[PDB]
Amino acid sequence: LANVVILATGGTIAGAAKLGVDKLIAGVPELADIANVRGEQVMQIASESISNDDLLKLGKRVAELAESKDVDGIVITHGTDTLEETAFFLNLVEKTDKPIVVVGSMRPGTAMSADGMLNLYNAVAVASDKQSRGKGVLVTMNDEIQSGRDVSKAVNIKTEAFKSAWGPMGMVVEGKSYWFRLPAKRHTVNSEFDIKQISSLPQVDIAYGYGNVTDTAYKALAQNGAKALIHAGTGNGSVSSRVVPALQELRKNGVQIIRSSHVNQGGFVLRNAEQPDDKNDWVVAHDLNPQKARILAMVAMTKTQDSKELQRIFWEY
Amino acid sequence: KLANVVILATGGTIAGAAKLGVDKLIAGVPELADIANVRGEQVMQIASESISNDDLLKLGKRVAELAESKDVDGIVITHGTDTLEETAFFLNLVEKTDKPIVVVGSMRPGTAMSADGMLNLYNAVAVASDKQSRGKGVLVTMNDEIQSGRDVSKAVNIKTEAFKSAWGPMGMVVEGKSYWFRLPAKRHTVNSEFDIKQISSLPQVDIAYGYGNVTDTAYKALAQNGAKALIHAGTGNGSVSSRVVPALQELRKNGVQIIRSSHVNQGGFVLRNAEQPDDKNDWVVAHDLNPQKARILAMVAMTKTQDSKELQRIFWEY
Amino acid sequence: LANVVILATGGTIAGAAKLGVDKLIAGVPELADIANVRGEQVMQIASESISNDDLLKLGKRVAELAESKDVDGIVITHGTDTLEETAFFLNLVEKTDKPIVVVGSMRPGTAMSADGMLNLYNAVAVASDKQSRGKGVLVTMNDEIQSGRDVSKAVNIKTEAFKSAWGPMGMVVEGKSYWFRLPAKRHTVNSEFDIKQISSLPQVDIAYGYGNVTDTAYKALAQNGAKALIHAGTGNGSVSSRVVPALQELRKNGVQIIRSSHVNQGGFVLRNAEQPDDKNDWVVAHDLNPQKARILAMVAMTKTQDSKELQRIFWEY
Amino acid sequence: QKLANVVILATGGTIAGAGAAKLGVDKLIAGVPELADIANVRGEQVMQIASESISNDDLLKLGKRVAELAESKDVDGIVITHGTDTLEETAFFLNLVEKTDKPIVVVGSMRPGTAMSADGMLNLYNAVAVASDKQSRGKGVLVTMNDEIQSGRDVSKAVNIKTEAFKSAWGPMGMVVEGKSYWFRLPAKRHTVNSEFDIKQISSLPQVDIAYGYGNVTDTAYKALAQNGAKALIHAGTGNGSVSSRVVPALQELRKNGVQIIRSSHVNQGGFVLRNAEQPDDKNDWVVAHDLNPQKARILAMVAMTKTQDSKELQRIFWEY
Ligand SMILES: N[C@@H](CC(=O)O)C(=O)O
Ligand SMILES: N[C@@H](CC(=O)O)C(=O)O
Ligand SMILES: N[C@@H](CC(=O)O)C(=O)O
Ligand SMILES: N[C@@H](CC(=O)O)C(=O)O
């Protein structure tokens, strides 16, 4: 049987973030049928409260485990609120074909019809499966195999919370994986980024666009350290004429201006359509939602501050 | 006898070469005369991402004047898609008329291959002219659908199916005919407590985003710049970072309303007292309303009340 | 507390259709917090094997319970395969404002993260809520309140199985009901149909449309006693040139011809668009899928043989 | 001139309608003057039909035309204009039998070109743009409606009336915007150059028919369809390809008498039919159709049964394609 390590970080999957990883494992006795499992407690947090120091710590531990010939696959138990951020971060920085699965639950294990037991079983099943090798980071909730790149928490309350605009890649049913699509975007072994060479993360913040929005949050975020601002625009990353001149001033001051959107079910932000990105030296976030865009920007800016290069990266990952 | 419909033009891609005037929009759809007696007015000519509160009030006031007119049976507003959902919701809250009001845009300009605006505008006029539209609240007629102005949102970029509701389309409009499948459940228009005839200004309300490693910076700055309420676009069920909570408590104590929405917009809602102790902190949840929708309801509600209990009632009824 | 009766019919919700109704109720001890529950076993079937006599027996028993002063609400536990058919049938024939909720589960109770406990709790909650009165028949799976009219089993395996083209009407969360839409179509107390008058249903059958289809299934079904045929056409209820003449002959000879489709995520079939329905005296099924269209056709034909009236009905219900 | 050579094989449909199957291919091309900017476009009228009336003879004819053009050094990509009703069936058929890496795009429209805001102009432009793009090579058969790049394998007509008609349970693979292609997923199932099937070796298709499952269903349709020549039956079941107890005996007798029994469903937005779950497939020597809808399962079975009548081999095929 495969050797799978479970790194626990908290979340509702661990709600009485109360239960330790040994308790979570003990709650799924059937894990022993499909893998040789062992658990570590990396942290014990509510994921809405995650820090960049937590991401790096988790990232570095995943890398140490992926380097061990004693580990075949890795599962991370996590809160659902920022699961999608972690999953994408690991997809960019972990230079391994070994399976990495991120899993949570919408209901604590004490609730009626709690979803974590089966989610956790499926995460270990997928992490133990030869078919998962080289697929990038995966998320295994709602019987699905979702790409960590572009899966997002799209539905509140319901167990079907996690969706991608580009569909699930597969399903996991009675411990068996069934694949229907492969990834197209750069990940894990084919990434130019590596956690082994990342000691610090640049500060990236996010500001919302809406009717009657001002330049206030943009300026204030930059003044308090943002090296890049993700603009969560209306429509195709649209920017109000009131706010354009502030963003131009920010960019000249050296803040990357990355146009994302709050239009998150499909489509993407097209360069030079709604704003003159060439003239302004701005970047579009392609299909990536604001919080995903922030992750890619921050990892990218460990390597380059060149806005052309950042655009390439937003078109490749 | 054909319905008298007024088209209030505001700009948007439907008018792209916000370049074409209302008379040219109407001339572009000669089949309109088969379904209604149409006349056009240019209220403004903007890209909707650049709309101001002043612009939004001008539109609201003018809709009310035309609604009160005996020569008007329905009203169509042509509008940019970017903030169409915000305008539609605003009108839903403040226009105390049973006359149909339809807001419509397009994802492509009329110059484009397979442009969507012609049929969208025809469908808008058809719905505004239909007896079945009376008393249904503000409607949005894109993609052959009849969508509620309350909770339709621009959810898909690029594609003509851009506008979606978590609660589904209420109907369809096909070869000029309306087909209904659901009715509204939330308060609107004639059943609303709000009235644009009493509203000539709007309180400043702003939106701050939640994500990993977020700080209190944006919340503080928006309040320092005049925000009377903050919409929190949280992760998950309106969840708030432990590093933000203290600032939100400070701001609420200074009189700023704290309203928990989310960026989890395909379904579900934010539940009071679940992720945060709303009762203890005297905060409000935005129920199913996305952050921009939440901001429009908060700003309208705060013309009438600063009581967070009443605000919450309003978030549960509209 | 509301007096709720649970009428068990079988399904995976009763699997290990094995468990009796008293064991189902005992499996959710929390029901006693929210209603006074009593259970009856109406039948014990796999819903894929349901018959028209099963529908009548169930319907009649629901009508008897709705006429009782000691009953406030009724929950029917059911297999998921033909849940949508039963739900719709009851929507058409039960002339009561009392809540009627139909519920199943995708997983049996012995399974990891089984969905039946919470679905049954929610069903009782909804059946006990004054907000459910007058709403028609409801389906309460996946934390949703779905209309019995047009909810369908659209997704296999997953707990989100049940979807409507026109959206959920509400949600049920920690026992509380939250409404967002109301029904538009005729149902229950405002239906012209009543189960008290119906002794046996007309035989109606369904034939599929696809490339290189012939008239064989249509003729055989009619030969073996179909009084209407639901055409599950491609597209907008489209009919092959090789099939049209047979359907003209079958209509001439008194068989109703109802054009539905296997295009079931959205839209509707439009009269006179793909076929000359007025000339052929055929009927379109509007938005209704083939199995739902069958239910409506059977009920409708208990009142009328006039295709114009049948079309009215397909446009109102 | 460096522009890609793209041939449009017209077959009919609403894309060729007036307010179906009225306009010839020259009028289609002439209606998109911009095609000249992106490819060297030539046409051929293969047929002129409403696609709900397509035959197996029509499929073979089309397949063989596609094959010859794919073999031509003077053709870079192929576009088929088609009625939307059975577009999904043709697109999957070609994905199974065309042993080429050259782009093949199937396209239709929901509205005729005479209509307000007609969809066909842009759909055809996008089909040509995709058929001309190097990124399309090796991707299998594509469908390019609603600004999407969909897999011909598992895209289906799922929404009536609206221009977003075509959907896949597994998502769009890409989008096409201002003539440019943007990819987000790749195929996982066998297709085209990696298919074991080849139209060059198929002169005949075995007869396959489809019957529906629903309450109070009987064995009548299954028996009549087999009596009138069906070599396989696709069972369009409720739920997880579930079969009524009233029908099971009939399917066992048909199977014993040489008729393949293939369990699909009318549950088409997600999931799949799992072997041995609702019916003892092993014991009965039946096949499950996996995620494939009934009409898609019929195409696969038809093609598969040109090579094998071993139900174990047919199940392998339903799990690989
Ligand atoms: N707030 C929790 C929610 C969850 O896990 O469902 C977390 O993200 O830690
Ligand atoms: N930026 C435009 C987009 C559109 O109308 O589609 C607007 O909102 O005015
Ligand atoms: N075949 C079972 C499946 C289920 O209940 O989920 C039934 O319909 O009875
Ligand atoms: N019945 C037409 C429909 C269309 O093309 O949209 C066809 O399939 O030929």
Same domain, yes or no: B236 and B165: no
- List the subunits that have 3+ CB pairs under 8 angstroms with D: A, B, C
Same domain, yes or no: C64 and C110: yes
Domain closes at, from D146, D177, D194: D194
Domain closes at, from B161, B191, B221: B191
Which chain C residue's Cα is nearest to D292?
C156
Tell how far the Cα of D230 is from the centroid of ligand 3, in angstroms: 29
Q: Which of B115, B119, B161 sits opposite D164 (nearest CB)?
A: B161
User: Which ligand has an atom closest to residue D111 CA?
Assistant: 4
Same domain, yes or no: C129 and C261: no
HEC string for B48-94 = HHHCCHHHHHHHHHHHHHHHCCCCCCEEEEECCCCCHHHHHHHHHHH
Q: Chains B and D: how many Cβ contacts under 8 Å?
A: 47
Same domain, yes or no: C249 and C129: no
What does B116-166 look like in DSSP terms, one character per residue? SHHHHHHHHHHHHT-GGGTTS-SEE--TTEEEETTT-EE-BSSSTT-EE-T
Q: Is C81 annotated as a binding residue?
A: yes
Domain closes at, from B191, B208, B225: B191
Q: Is the CB of A202 under 6 A from ligand 2?
A: no
User: In angstroms, what is the C-alpha Rg of chain D?
Assistant: 20
Taking the mean position of all CA atoms in its chain, how far away is CA D18?
Answer: 25
Cβ contacts (< 8 Å) between D115 and chain B: which residues?
Answer: 119
CA distance D186 to chain B (A): 21
Which of B153, B181, B288 to mutate against chain C (most C CBs within 10 Å)?
A: B181
Identify the CATH number of the domain in which residue B15 sits: 3.40.50.1170
Return the number of other C-beta atoms located less than 10 Å from residue C26's C-beta: 12
What residues of D form the annotated binding site? 51, 84-85
Quick one: which H or E segment has residue D58?
helix D56-71
- Domain residues for the domain of D166 are 5-194
Same domain, yes or no: A301 and A166: no
Tokens of C294: 């069958």
CA distance A131 to A115: 24
CA distance B81 to B24: 19
| Axis crossing angle, helix D220-227 with helix D248-256, rounded to the nearest 10 | 20
C109: left (phi over 0), alpha (psi -120 to 50) or beta: alpha
What does C202-263 look like in DSSP terms, one character per residue? PPEEEEE--TT--SHHHHHHHHTT-SEEEEEEBTTTB--TTTHHHHHHHHHTT-EEEEEES-
Taking the mean position of all CA atoms in its chain, how far away is CA B146?
Answer: 14
Tokens of D43: 């046409």
CB contact set of A312 (below 8 Å; sequence gap of 6+): none
Cβ contacts (< 8 Å) between B180 and chain C: which residues?
Answer: 184
Q: Which of B51, B211, B237 sits opposite A211 (nearest CB)?
A: B51
Tokens of C48: 């894929």
CA distance C77 to C139: 10
Tell how far the Cα of D263 is from the centroid of ligand 3, in angstroms: 16
Same domain, yes or no: A18 and A34: yes
What does A124-183 look like in DSSP terms, one character per residue? HHHHT-GGGTTS-SEE--TTEEEETTT-EE-BSSSTT-EE-TT--SEEEETTEEEE-EEE
Under 8 Å between Cβ of B308 and B279: no
CA distance A152 to B226: 33
Q: For A212, how many CA atoms within 13 A lie in the half-sphere containing its CB?
A: 22
CA distance D48 to chain A (A): 34
Same domain, yes or no: A129 and A34: yes
Cβ contacts (< 8 Å) between C165 and chain B: which residues?
Answer: 168, 181
Residue A128: φ, ψ to 5°: -90, -5
Give the burial class of B131: count Cβ atoms within 10 A of its Cβ; 0-12 exposed, 13-18 middle, 19 or more buried.
exposed
Residue C11, CA distances (Å) to C78, C123, D175, D239 in order: 5, 15, 42, 12
CA distance B316 to B303: 18
CA distance C257 to C260: 10
Number of domains in chain D: 2
Tell how far the Cα of C106 is from the centroid of ligand 3, in angstroms: 7
One-letter amino acid at C118 equals L
Under 8 Å between Cβ of D231 and D180: no
Tokens of D174: 């890409």
CA distance D136 to D105: 9
Sign of the torsion formed by the C-alpha atoms of D291, D297, D299 and D302: positive
What does A172-236 look like in DSSP terms, one character per residue? EETTEEEE-EEE-S--GGG-S--GGG-S----EEEEE--TT--SHHHHHHHHTT-SEEEEEEBTT
CA distance A204 to A283: 14
Tokens of B97: 């008329």
Method underlying the structure: X-ray
Same domain, yes or no: A212 and A153: no
Same domain, yes or no: A125 and A244: no
CA distance D104 to D142: 6
What does B181-204 look like in DSSP terms, one character per residue? -EEE-S--GGG-S--GGG-S----
One-letter amino acid at C100 equals I
Contact C240 D294 (CB under 8 A): no
Tokens of B162: 């851009």
Same domain, yes or no: D204 and D184: no
Q: Which of A164, A171, A178 sits opposite D171 (nearest CB)?
A: A164
Same domain, yes or no: A134 and A215: no
Tell how far the Cα of A317 is from the centroid of ligand 2, in angstroms: 28
Catalytic residue IDs of C: 12
Residue B103: φ, ψ to 5°: -110, 135
Identify the CATH number of the domain in which residue D267 sits: 3.40.50.40
Tokens of D67: 């094959």
Taking the mean position of all CA atoms in its chain, how far away is CA B161?
Answer: 17
CA distance A123 to A5: 11
Taking the mean position of all CA atoms in its chain, how far away is CA C133?
Answer: 19
Contact C167 B172 (CB under 8 A): no
Give the burial class of A254: count Cβ atoms within 10 A of its Cβ; 0-12 exposed, 13-18 middle, 19 or more buried.
exposed
Tell how far the Cα of A212 is from the centroid of ligand 2, in angstroms: 15
CA distance A85 to A79: 11
Tokens of B88: 């539609």
Cβ contacts (< 8 Å) between C167 and chain B: which residues?
Answer: 165-169, 182
CA distance B199 to chain C (A): 27
- Residue identified by tokens 């395909």 is B266
Q: Is the CB of C11 under 6 A from ligand 3?
A: yes
Instruction: Tell which residue, C206, C211, C257, C215, has the closest CA to residue C234.
Output: C211
Taking the mean position of all CA atoms in its chain, how far away is CA C49?
Answer: 15
What residues of A form the annotated binding site for substrate? 47, 80-81
Cβ contacts (< 8 Å) between C86 and chain D: which residues?
Answer: 215
Strand pairing report for A144-147 and A152-153: unpaired
Q: Is the CB of A310 under 6 A from ligand 1?
A: no
Give ligand 4 pocket residues (Cβ under 6 A): C 235, 238; D 12-14, 20, 50-52, 83-85, 108, 110
Same domain, yes or no: C181 and C224: no
One-letter amino acid at C188 equals T
One-letter amino acid at B178 equals S
Report the atom number in ligand 3 closest to the C-alpha of C104. Answer: 5
